[PDB]
Amino acid sequence: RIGYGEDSHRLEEGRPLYLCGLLIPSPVGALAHSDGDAAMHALTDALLSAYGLGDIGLLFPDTDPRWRGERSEVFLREAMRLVEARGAKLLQASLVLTLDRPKLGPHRKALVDSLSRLMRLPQDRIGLTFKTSEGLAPSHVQARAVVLLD
Amino acid sequence: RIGYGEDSHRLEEGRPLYLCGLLIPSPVGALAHSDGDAAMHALTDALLSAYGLGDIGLLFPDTDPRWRGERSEVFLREAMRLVEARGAKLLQASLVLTLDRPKLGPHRKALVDSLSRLMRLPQDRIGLTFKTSEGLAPSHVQARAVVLLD
Amino acid sequence: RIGYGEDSHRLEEGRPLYLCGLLIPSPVGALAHSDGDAAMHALTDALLSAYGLGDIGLLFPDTDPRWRGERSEVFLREAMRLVEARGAKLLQASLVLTLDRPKLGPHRKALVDSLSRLMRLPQDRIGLTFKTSEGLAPSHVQARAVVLLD
Ligand SMILES: [Mg+2]
Ligand SMILES: [Mg+2]
Ligand SMILES: [Mg+2]
Questions:
Q1: Which residues in chain B are closer than 8 Å to A5, comparing Cβ atoms?
Q2: N or C, which end of chain C is more exposed by having fewer CB within 10 Å?
Q3: Helix-strand-coil percent breakdown of chain C, rounded to 5?
């Protein structure tokens, strides 16, 4: 099975930046409703999608209590619980993060380590790459992810 | 086999909106010479791509009378005919629709039912997720799609 | 295994345009430090991604004299070497190129032939499709690619 997901958020000065589950030192952070972790959101949608289960807007509306104030690993692990209950064995996640600042290169090890631990995948099965928008989208973070299961 | 397809269209106020084969009540709709159904176009290109057959610009140009003015479902069924004749067995389609309005949430069932009916896939093999652009692309509808076959 | 990658470049008047390893006659070309071949970059990142090896920013930085000034095909071939050494057999590449000008249609055969030769894949396993941005991004070339291996 395959799943594909995307996420993006406005970034603003003096807000915390969360990506791949981690708080990243940055001059900008998401202007969100959530922690705005675009990588987790894209991955979560990709997982749900692989089983036709909907998306984070359907399954995690803030109006449900359990989701209000929650960090995005809660959404990811619930999607993992849902596909696992349907017999899924996650094999791989490959995703691209796009943002002009800050540079994610120095945080490569930490970001992969976190995704590896969250999705319970070996490091060679976490394919994370970083891009800038080349001035296409200087005020957003963007994420696009593909997952592979069984 | 895997295929990847994308489409985007300018949205204009007061034009009809077509997605996944359906008319969706909306304040905005594609400005296009086609019906502008980004979902159909992205899926069609992904199917073509999975066999290297080209893209919808090549196979369904507005110059070709058989295709001019037709709804986009006609091009998807033709792409399905072409890949089926080359032995394809479509397994899964996962795609993301991005647009700032209207909300697609209320239409989720009919949209997924449509894709399942047109592509002849069970609903758990239709992975449809909805996003807004968070202000990055407030005047366009975008779709990106992955298909898996065989 | 699966890998996903993306690339974009600002386009500027009177610069040469390189795509899929070829010179493409054009009024606009990438402004950059590389040849700005978005197809090559996105394919290379997708390959690297399929094995968790990093991305082109990590492995091919212009601080490294081995890589500065090299054509992007040299990067793609090195990524091929690295995954092949880890047992991979590339099976398929499917990608989308997005740009408002020049038209890529007239170059389809040459572009696909180049990808086929470079990646040593049969033509039906090269899924290249072309799009314009519909004015979303009229001054960039964008590429997004999925690769499948084994
Ligand atoms: Mg989000
Ligand atoms: Mg279209
Ligand atoms: Mg590049």
A1: 96, 129
A2: C
A3: 35, 30, 35
Distances (CA, A) of B34 to A30, B9, B56: 36, 10, 11
Resolution (A): 1.5
B86 contact partners, CB below 8 Å, separation of at least 6: B51, C124
User: CA A79, CA C133: separation in Å to the nearest integer?
Assistant: 33
Architecture, CATH, for domain A1-150: 2-Layer Sandwich (3.30)
| Neighbouring-strand partners of residue C11 | C30
Q: Distance from A139 to chain B by nearest Cα, in Å?
A: 8
* DSSP 3-state of B66: coil
Please report residues of C whose CB lies closer than 8 A to that of B140: 134, 136
Method used to determine the 3D structure: X-ray
**With an 8 Å Cβ cutoff, are A94 and C48 in contact?**
no
Asked if C1 lies within 8 A of A96 by C-beta distance, the reply is no
Q: Quote the CA–CA distance of A50 and C65 in Å, as a whole number.
A: 43
Show the tokens assigned to A8.
């993006």
| Identity of the residue in A126, A128, A133 whose CB atom sits nearest the CB atom of C8 | A133
C94: nearest CB among B4, B58, B86: B4
How would DSSP label each residue in B67-81? TTT--HHHHHHHHHH
List of chain B residues whose C-beta atoms are within 8 Å of the C-beta of residue C144: 4, 6, 144
Give the residue from chain A lying closest to B129, CA to CA. Answer: A55
Q: Return the residue matching tokens 């697609």.
A: B104
